[PDB]
Amino acid sequence: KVFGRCELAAAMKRHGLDNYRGYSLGNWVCAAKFESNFNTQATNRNTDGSTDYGILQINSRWWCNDGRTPGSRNLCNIPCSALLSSDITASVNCAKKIVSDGNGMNAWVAWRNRCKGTDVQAWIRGCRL
Numbered sequence: 111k112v113f114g115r116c117e118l119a120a121a122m123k124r125h126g127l128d129n130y131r132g133y134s135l136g137n138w139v140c141a142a143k144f145e146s147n148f149n150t151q152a153t154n155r156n157t158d159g160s161t162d163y164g165i166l167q168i169n170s171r172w173w174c175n176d177g178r179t180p181g182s183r184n185l186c187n188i189p190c191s192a193l194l195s196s197d198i199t200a201s202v203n204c205a206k207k208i209v210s211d212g213n214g215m216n217a218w219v220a221w222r223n224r225c226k227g228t229d230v231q232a233w234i235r236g237c238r239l
């Protein structure tokens with residue numbers, strides 16, 4: 111599924127991401143935009159053989175099992191395929207664990223390089239929240 115901007119904002123808010131670990135909703139929508147362009151089916155292969163999955167491009171090195179990332183962990187205890195669902199619950203629940211790991215949203219390289227320090231509120235402007 112390709113979410114609309116405000117559609118994704120609303121789902122993320124409902125699932126408890128707004129100000130989660132102190133990160134405003136706009137940060138999460140911005141991250142999603144530049145990670146997946148709001149596409150739940152987005153996948154991207156990393157040089158180390160791990161794969162990023164879903165709206166927030168959560169990686170199999172640490173966070174999900176795809177049966178094909180040697181040495182990896184599955185700290186969110188999910189198949190990586192669950193991150194591709196039109197239902198974003200697994201993505202959000204896992205993102206909550208990631209952003210609590212100590213580095214906050216810097217865990218998402220695209221967030222650090224394209225969202226951090228920007229007017230992230232713009233990503234939820236206009237939305238009925």
Ligand SMILES: [Cl-]
Binds near residue numbers: 115143
């Ligand atoms: Cl957009």
Ligand SMILES: [Cl-]
Binds near residue numbers: 134137
């Ligand atoms: Cl915001």
Ligand SMILES: [Cl-]
Binds near residue numbers: 175176177179181182
């Ligand atoms: Cl594996």
Ligand SMILES: [Cl-]
Binds near residue numbers: 196197
């Ligand atoms: Cl959902």
Ligand SMILES: [Cl-]
Binds near residue numbers: 125198200
């Ligand atoms: Cl959730």
Ligand SMILES: [Cl-]
Binds near residue numbers: 132213215
């Ligand atoms: Cl933080």
Ligand SMILES: [N]
Binds near residue numbers: 121197198
């Ligand atoms: N949802």
Ligand SMILES: [N]
Binds near residue numbers: 124125126
């Ligand atoms: N939720």
Ligand SMILES: [N]
Binds near residue numbers: 125126
């Ligand atoms: N949730």
Ligand code: NA
Binds near residue numbers: 174176177
């Ligand atoms: Na894994």
Ligand SMILES: [Pt+2]
Binds near residue numbers: 111112150151195
């Ligand atoms: Pt879909």
Ligand SMILES: [Pt+2]
Binds near residue numbers: 121124125198199
């Ligand atoms: Pt939902």
Ligand SMILES: [Pt+2]
Binds near residue numbers: 124125126199202
């Ligand atoms: Pt939820």
Ligand SMILES: [Pt+2]
Binds near residue numbers: 125126
């Ligand atoms: Pt929660």
Ligand SMILES: [Pt+2]
Binds near residue numbers: 147
């Ligand atoms: Pt777009």
